[PDB]
Design an enzyme around this catalytic site. Structure first.
Site, PDB file in Angstrom:
ATOM      1  N   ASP A  96       8.273 -10.676   7.526  1.00 19.38           N
ATOM      2  CA  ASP A  96       8.647  -9.528   8.341  1.00 19.38           C
ATOM      3  C   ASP A  96      10.095  -9.182   8.026  1.00 19.38           C
ATOM      4  O   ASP A  96      10.997  -9.987   8.277  1.00 19.38           O
ATOM      5  CB  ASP A  96       8.474  -9.858   9.825  1.00 19.38           C
ATOM      6  CG  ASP A  96       8.679  -8.660  10.738  1.00 19.38           C
ATOM      7  OD1 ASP A  96       9.568  -7.819  10.468  1.00 19.38           O
ATOM      8  OD2 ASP A  96       7.940  -8.572  11.751  1.00 19.38           O
TER       9      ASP A  96
ATOM     10  N   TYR B 126      12.226   8.304  15.473  1.00 21.95           N
ATOM     11  CA  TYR B 126      12.142   8.272  14.017  1.00 21.95           C
ATOM     12  C   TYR B 126      13.254   9.084  13.366  1.00 21.95           C
ATOM     13  O   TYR B 126      13.847   8.643  12.376  1.00 21.95           O
ATOM     14  CB  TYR B 126      10.784   8.802  13.582  1.00 21.95           C
ATOM     15  CG  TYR B 126      10.481   8.705  12.098  1.00 21.95           C
ATOM     16  CD1 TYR B 126      10.155   7.486  11.514  1.00 21.95           C
ATOM     17  CD2 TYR B 126      10.468   9.837  11.304  1.00 21.95           C
ATOM     18  CE1 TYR B 126       9.822   7.399  10.171  1.00 21.95           C
ATOM     19  CE2 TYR B 126      10.152   9.760   9.961  1.00 21.95           C
ATOM     20  CZ  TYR B 126       9.834   8.544   9.404  1.00 21.95           C
ATOM     21  OH  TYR B 126       9.515   8.470   8.065  1.00 21.95           O
TER      22      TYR B 126
ATOM     23  N   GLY C 263       8.799   1.159   6.712  1.00 19.30           N
ATOM     24  CA  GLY C 263       9.140   2.153   7.702  1.00 19.30           C
ATOM     25  C   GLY C 263       7.927   2.430   8.548  1.00 19.30           C
ATOM     26  O   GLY C 263       6.794   2.296   8.073  1.00 19.30           O
TER      27      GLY C 263
ATOM     28  N   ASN D 124      11.685   0.456   1.575  1.00 15.13           N
ATOM     29  CA  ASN D 124      10.597   1.392   1.813  1.00 15.13           C
ATOM     30  C   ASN D 124       9.826   1.111   3.099  1.00 15.13           C
ATOM     31  O   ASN D 124       9.180   2.025   3.622  1.00 15.13           O
ATOM     32  CB  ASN D 124       9.638   1.383   0.610  1.00 15.13           C
ATOM     33  CG  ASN D 124       8.342   2.108   0.891  1.00 15.13           C
ATOM     34  OD1 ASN D 124       8.283   3.333   0.859  1.00 15.13           O
ATOM     35  ND2 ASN D 124       7.299   1.352   1.178  1.00 15.13           N
TER      36      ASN D 124
ATOM     37  N   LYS E 253       6.064  10.065  19.886  1.00 16.07           N
ATOM     38  CA  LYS E 253       5.872  10.296  21.310  1.00 16.07           C
ATOM     39  C   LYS E 253       6.984  11.218  21.760  1.00 16.07           C
ATOM     40  O   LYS E 253       8.112  11.085  21.285  1.00 16.07           O
ATOM     41  CB  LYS E 253       5.928   8.985  22.113  1.00 16.07           C
ATOM     42  CG  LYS E 253       5.038   8.951  23.342  1.00 16.07           C
ATOM     43  CD  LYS E 253       3.596   8.705  22.912  1.00 16.07           C
ATOM     44  CE  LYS E 253       2.686   8.311  24.052  1.00 16.07           C
ATOM     45  NZ  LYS E 253       1.459   7.656  23.504  1.00 16.07           N
TER      46      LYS E 253
ATOM     47  N   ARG F 216       0.844  -1.189   0.000  1.00 10.69           N
ATOM     48  CA  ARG F 216       0.000   0.000   0.000  1.00 10.69           C
ATOM     49  C   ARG F 216       0.882   1.241   0.000  1.00 10.69           C
ATOM     50  O   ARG F 216       2.106   1.161   0.139  1.00 10.69           O
ATOM     51  CB  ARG F 216      -0.937   0.009   1.212  1.00 10.69           C
ATOM     52  CG  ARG F 216      -0.200   0.133   2.531  1.00 10.69           C
ATOM     53  CD  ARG F 216      -1.100  -0.211   3.708  1.00 10.69           C
ATOM     54  NE  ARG F 216      -0.317  -0.614   4.873  1.00 10.69           N
ATOM     55  CZ  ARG F 216      -0.828  -1.170   5.968  1.00 10.69           C
ATOM     56  NH1 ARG F 216      -2.133  -1.391   6.060  1.00 10.69           N
ATOM     57  NH2 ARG F 216      -0.031  -1.510   6.973  1.00 10.69           N
TER      58      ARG F 216
ATOM     59  N   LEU G 138       9.965  12.171  24.053  1.00 10.14           N
ATOM     60  CA  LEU G 138      10.923  11.266  24.671  1.00 10.14           C
ATOM     61  C   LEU G 138      10.549  10.960  26.115  1.00 10.14           C
ATOM     62  O   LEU G 138      10.709   9.822  26.571  1.00 10.14           O
ATOM     63  CB  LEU G 138      12.334  11.859  24.584  1.00 10.14           C
ATOM     64  CG  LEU G 138      13.469  10.953  25.069  1.00 10.14           C
ATOM     65  CD1 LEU G 138      13.475   9.643  24.283  1.00 10.14           C
ATOM     66  CD2 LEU G 138      14.819  11.661  24.964  1.00 10.14           C
TER      67      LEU G 138
ATOM     68  N   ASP H 144       5.926  -7.573   2.058  1.00 10.80           N
ATOM     69  CA  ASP H 144       5.248  -6.961   3.201  1.00 10.80           C
ATOM     70  C   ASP H 144       4.885  -8.086   4.163  1.00 10.80           C
ATOM     71  O   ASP H 144       5.093  -9.266   3.866  1.00 10.80           O
ATOM     72  CB  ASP H 144       4.012  -6.164   2.776  1.00 10.80           C
ATOM     73  CG  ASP H 144       3.786  -4.907   3.629  1.00 10.80           C
ATOM     74  OD1 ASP H 144       4.134  -4.915   4.833  1.00 10.80           O
ATOM     75  OD2 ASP H 144       3.264  -3.898   3.088  1.00 10.80           O
TER      76      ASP H 144
END
Lengths: 432, 460
Positions: free
Chosen positions: B276, B367, B304, B302, B309, B232, B311, B253
């Site tokens: 996975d 991230y 990701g 790709n 949040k 997707r 820290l 995927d």
């Protein structure tokens, strides 16, 4: 919207850090002895968690590292310093989480987050190079997230150059770096040189171009505060303001056009009676904003000339004709527009991207311990509603913030700070 | 909500830097020919060294090409077979789809006015969705310090043009390493073409490598590609473009996505691998899945995730998972493929970073760390690659996806507005840039990280 937090700025040489410092380090780190020695030198209350290796490093240098109870969520630290040099691969990036998550609400207002790592290009393995590169993403996010006027920096120390970190760690720990955040500083190998940290330019002679007003005047005041005799340079039309600035700092004047062919010759001649020139700050600069379509040719030419070509000619003369003393300093002034571009500034941004190249490609050929670096100021108080708030400090900077960063580059002790372009922008949103 | 944003300081910040919103409908890829719809104006500084290679590309793509009163440039173009029609310098009316300037002849800062000489007279004659392309000599490879400095200055110029010219026009600098002119073609075609619609303000480095034969209409013909996160979103769009260019795409995927994987593979004549990517054996299974097709040529990392949040509130496993999926898993797979004969000669590794990896972001300490690590993965793997294999990354800015509606209004509104295109990008824009890296012809494109962001205001 909140109004901005009032930032702490320089008040006196001591204390370097008002408040407590908390130190941490990743397993197998190599910069903790050098960090501990700086903390001992500046006589700050220093704390450490349950890291025996790091506790031993502070013992080796006589630093009383007060243990910090990991159950203590209430104590506040003015700075948190993390040796990340031991992070060897991406999985060990969680050492950043392990140190910083437990204390992320305990950094004081106007505080400091400082991550000290190994320059990725000098790392011995690819896996460590990758992990050390990742530190920049972490610190830039911390700089945007912690608020309260806190700054966040990564200092990269070239493998083997731990002895050269002190002046940079001192600047970042101190209020002098109030408007420097989100930035990457590279420390390289060089001779260590004796210094009076209270007057780190004592005995030196500095020259500041465009010195009669604005940021150039602020530069001259801070260089004189650090002990330098300042030659204030600007055009003869500014002689009255030059005299005013020189009288305020115990300096002297040199009223010439920096773009003249003989400028370097006259600069060298002017400093001969003081024993030669130690520091030159290329602050002279102009904007002539115009869309490219409307811009006249001479307004392209003038901006390139004053902002870039003129400093090139002067540097060429001084470096080729014994015009700078050993351990000398060249400090240039770029701009966020040189990094990011700006509408109406095709001329100015070209000139200031040129200045970045001037720093980057002069740095490797310097000898005799001379260094070259640049500041890249963001929004400094003198598009204005635009600039002011669009940074992690939520406010514009002050001329003294740019001057402090220039003075850190110029410090007699910053022998291993070379080739750096450091933004003075409070972590402005803009960039490349 | 929209009027409030505009009146807010960030909205005024947008308007002061980019003007009021006048976004263009950007031209995108429709067919392999013509590469450029419209006329191209070429120029060069005195003593430039890249103009023969530029002219050969313009001859190869059969575009109507024009030139001012530059005799040396006319003679060099004619020598390699390009007809350059004269462009009367008193013509303020003609429009050019692309303006291409060889800046390699700029030897010092005083010669930077060659940029003014070429671009000021035509600054209002670039077509909508047009191209400003400055081609120079990589500063690190220039023979003199003075030229290195002047070539470095080109980036400040093009970044300002990218913000000033408007009209959906993009602006790029291509640096060609001294001696690497024959390796420029796939990059110049990508930038000239509508494929690069959402790439602007960027620096691309071309280095020396073998020049390989290619079918430019199907630049991945005969090759087998693997795309992670393919079921997707941007991964699906990547898979479509790689198949369009001639590749057989293995769509990878998680097994939970098997239905969508099957749907995507049938849409592109590809196949599926439902695993996975973080599994210790993912590298082995990837190599096995390509074994019966001649081996693996192209891998696009790709897959990701975000786990946003602060820290202070972030749990340990939400740090670990983001680093693992976004960075460590790609390292393991690359290590396995590169050490166990898992990528064919002239192979391609393409990674996906992010603007947040470059600029940082509140709530993205995990991230942004992982995506800054991806930049390191590209930069420090590139020098050790052998056998013609290259590694590059895209760093997407704000892209319109099916996940965009989940983004809070203010972050999404800034994403749409804070770029020179004054709009969000499309997944195909990311896919096209990945496809250019993957091109069989992109042999001298290695170690690049190219933002796909429409020249977002954000950066380092």
């Amino acid at each position: 919207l909140p109004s901005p937090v009032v930032l702490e700025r320089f008040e006196s040489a001591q204390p370097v850090v008002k408040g407590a410092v908390l130190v941490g380090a990743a397993p197998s780190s190599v910069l903790s002895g050098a960090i501990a020695q700086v903390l001992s030198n500046i006589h700050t209350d220093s704390y450490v968690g349950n890291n025996v290796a790091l506790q031993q490093e502070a013992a080796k240098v006589g630093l009383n590292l007060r243990p910090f109870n990991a159950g203590d969520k209430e104590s506040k630290f003015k700075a948190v310093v993390f040796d990340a040099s031991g992070i060897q691969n991406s999985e060990q990036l969680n050492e950043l989480y392990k140190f910083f998550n437990p204390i992320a609400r305990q950094v004081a207002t106007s505080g400091r987050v400082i991550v000290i790592g190994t320059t990725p290009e000098t790392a011995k393995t690819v896996k460590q190079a990758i992990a050390q590169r990742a530190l920049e993403g972490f610190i830039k996010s911390v700089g945007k997230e912690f608020k309260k006027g806190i700054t966040a920096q990564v200092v990269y120390v070239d493998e083997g150059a731990a002895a050269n970190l002190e002046s940079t760690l001192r600047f970042l720990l101190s209020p002098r770096s109030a408007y420097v955040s989100g930035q990457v500083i590279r420390v390289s190998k060089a001779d260590v040189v004796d210094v009076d940290w209270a007057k780190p330019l004592a005995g030196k002679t500095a020259l500041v171009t465009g010195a009669s007003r604005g940021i150039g005047e602020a530069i001259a005041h801070v260089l004189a505060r650090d002990g330098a005799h300042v030659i204030c340079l600007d055009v003869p039309q500014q002689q009255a303001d030059l005299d005013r600035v020189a009288a305020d700092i115990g300096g002297s004047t040199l009223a010439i056009d920096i773009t003249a062919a003989d400028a370097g010759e006259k600069i060298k001649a002017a400093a001969a009676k003081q024993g030669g020139l130690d520091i030159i700050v290329h602050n002279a600069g102009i904007t002539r904003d115009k869309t490219l379509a409307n811009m006249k040719p001479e307004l392209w030419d003038l901006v390139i000339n004053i902002n870039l070509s003129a400093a090139e000619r002067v540097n060429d003369y001084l470096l080729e004709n014994d015009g700078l003393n050993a351990n000398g300093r060249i400090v240039c002034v770029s701009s966020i527009s040189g990094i990011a571009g700006n509408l109406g500034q095709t001329n100015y941004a070209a000139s200031k991207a040129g200045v970045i190249g001037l720093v980057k490609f002069t740095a490797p050929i310097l000898k005799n311990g001379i260094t070259i670096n640049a500041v890249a100021p963001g929004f400094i108080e003198t598009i204005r509603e635009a600039g002011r708030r669009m940074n992690s400090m939520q406010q514009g900077g002050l001329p003294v913030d740019v001057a402090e960063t220039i003075a850190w580059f110029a410090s007699t002790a910053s022998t291993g700070v070379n080739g750096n372009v450091v933004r003075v922008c409070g972590q402005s949103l803009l960039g490349a």
